A paper describes a structure:
Members of the Vaccinia-related kinase (VRK) family of serine/threonine protein kinases are present in the genomes of all metazoans and those of poxviruses, including the family-founding member vaccinia virus B1R1–6. Here we present the first crystal structures of the kinase domain of VRK1 and the first crystal structures for ligand-bound VRK1 and VRK2. Ligand-bound VRK kinase domains adopt the canonical protein kinase fold, except for the presence of the additional α-helix between αC and β4 (αC4) exclusively found on VRK proteins. The ligand-bound structures obtained here for active VRKs are in a closed, active conformation and display the same overall organization previously observed for the apo-structures, including the position of the VRK-exclusive αC4 and the structural organization of conserved residues that make up the kinase hydrophobic spine36.
For VRK13-364, 29 compounds displayed changes in melting temperatures, ΔTm, larger than 2.0 °C (an arbitrary cut off for a positive hit in this experiment), with the top hit, GW297361X, displaying a ΔTm of 9.7 °C. The VRK13-364/GW92761X structure has a less ordered N-terminal domain and in two of the crystal polypeptide chains (C and D) models start after the protein P-loop region (residues 68 or 80). Nevertheless, the most complete polypeptide chain in this model contains an intact P-loop (chain A, residues 22–341; used for the structural comparisons below). The crystal structures of VRK13-364/GW297361X (chain A) and VRK214-335/BI-D1870 reveal that the glycine-rich P-loop region of these kinases can adopt the so-called folded conformation. In the VRK13-364/GW297361X structure, the folded conformation of the P-loop is stabilized by a sulfur-π interaction between Phe48 and the sulfur atom in the thiazole moiety of GW297361X. Other than this interaction, VRK13-364 P-loop residues do not contact atoms in the compound. Ligand GW297361X can stabilize the protein N-lobe via a sulfur-π interaction with P-loop residue Phe48. In this position, the side chain of Phe48 approaches those of Asp197 in the DYG motif and Asn182 at the ATP-binding site entrance to create a hydrophobic tunnel over the compound. Another important interaction facilitated by GW297361X involves the sulfonamide group and residues located just outside the hinge region.
Author numbering: 20 to 341
Write the structure that this text describes.
């Protein structure tokens, strides 16, 4: 066994006891096991949690842990859900963390909410397409998530279908994961300058990353919204104009800078035969008007997408249609 014996009892820093289960998949998310509260019974497939574990010196886990401790406390999320009158919030809940010894070496572990399949698998099973309803419903919930993490001094910088996981018991609830390279843009309310972060480089995923990230500057709120824009196009059409040139970041940036200058040209490239949904253009055009340090007007962005739902004879009923 690499880290935890199936059935082992671990106690976190607040003295809460958990039992370890089987590893969850083999994905490039690190070492993850199913977990539950300590009891006589074994941890089965009905496990509500997971234990993510990495060595103490691992920088990304610590950064990820700090974000979870700061912005993902269960009560902190519920207070936001009640005040903003949301059905749920797609920020995974943090249940505790601790240190674990294995063969004289120290490891830090974190207990989190458990999820089922990622969006990418569902997307690939649907022949690399998502309906206008699915895309607009996903996007409204990601705007809820982004407003929350932005209001908590963080930017994600890597929004994509493989970082969007679905609730293990509820298929209409999507969660944004992976904060290993999340960035604290305005610590103690002081916005970061328009320059690189000296400690780490937040490149993201080449196809979806923002122009700011391509320019080698620290990610900001506008960049998270821009990444979401490229996701929406990729989900509706299965393509992006720069998809055959990923090994060249100069090309990807060049293409993005040109397309930001003329959004009608992007709509023309991505949508065949002048069939482009108006709310995508109105959204790209609103994000375009944002300054590096500017607070986005989220409700206005959600209203642009709500107009898109009315155009297809629908309402925000929270149905993902997966
Ligand atoms: N498409 S899939 O079927 O291969 C698949 C992918 C992924 C997972 N599960 C990953 C996680 C899970 O269940 N809980 C958390 C909490 C935090 C977190 N942070 C990065 S990954 C992650 C996870 C299950 C199935
Ligand atoms: Cl295709």
């Amino acid at each position: 066994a690499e880290q935890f014996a199936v059935g082992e009892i671990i106690t976190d820093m607040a003295a809460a006891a958990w039992k370890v289960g089987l590893p969850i998949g083999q994905g490039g998310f690190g070492c993850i096991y199913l977990a539950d509260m300590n009891s006589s019974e074994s941890v089965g497939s009905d496990a509500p949690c997971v234990v993510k574990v990495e060595p103490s010196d691992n920088g990304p886990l610590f950064t990820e842990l700090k974000f979870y401790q700061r912005a993902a406390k269960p009560e902190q999320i519920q207070k936001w859900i009640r005040t903003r009158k949301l059905k749920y919030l797609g920020v995974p809940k943090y249940w505790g963390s601790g240190l674990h010894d294995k063969n004289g070496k120290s490891y830090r572990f974190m207990i989190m909410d458990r999820f089922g399949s990622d969006l990418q698998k569902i997307y690939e099973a649907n022949a690399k397409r998502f309906s206008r309803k699915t895309v607009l419903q996903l996007s409204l919930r990601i705007l809820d998530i982004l407003e929350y993490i932005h209001e908590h001094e963080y930017v994600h910088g890597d929004i994509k279908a493989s970082n969007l996981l679905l609730n293990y018991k509820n298929p209409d609830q999507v969660y944004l994961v992976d904060y290993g390279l999340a960035y604290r843009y305005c610590p103690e309310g002081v916005h970061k300058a328009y320059a690189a972060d000296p400690k780490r480089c937040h490149d993201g995923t080449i196809e979806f990353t923002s122009i700011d990230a391509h320019n080698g500057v620290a990610p900001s709120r506008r960049g998270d919204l821009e990444i979401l824009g490229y996701c929406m196009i990729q989900w509706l059409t299965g393509h992006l104009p720069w998809e055959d040139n990923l090994k060249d970041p100069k090309y990807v940036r060049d293409s993005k800078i040109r397309y930001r200058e003329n959004i009608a040209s992007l709509m023309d490239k991505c949508f065949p035969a002048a069939n482009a949904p108006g709310e995508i253009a109105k959204y790209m055009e609103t994000v375009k008007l944002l300054d590096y340090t500017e607070k986005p007007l989220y409700e206005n962005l959600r209203d642009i997408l709500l107009q898109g739902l009315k155009a297809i004879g629908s309402k925000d009923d929270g149905k993902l249609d997966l």
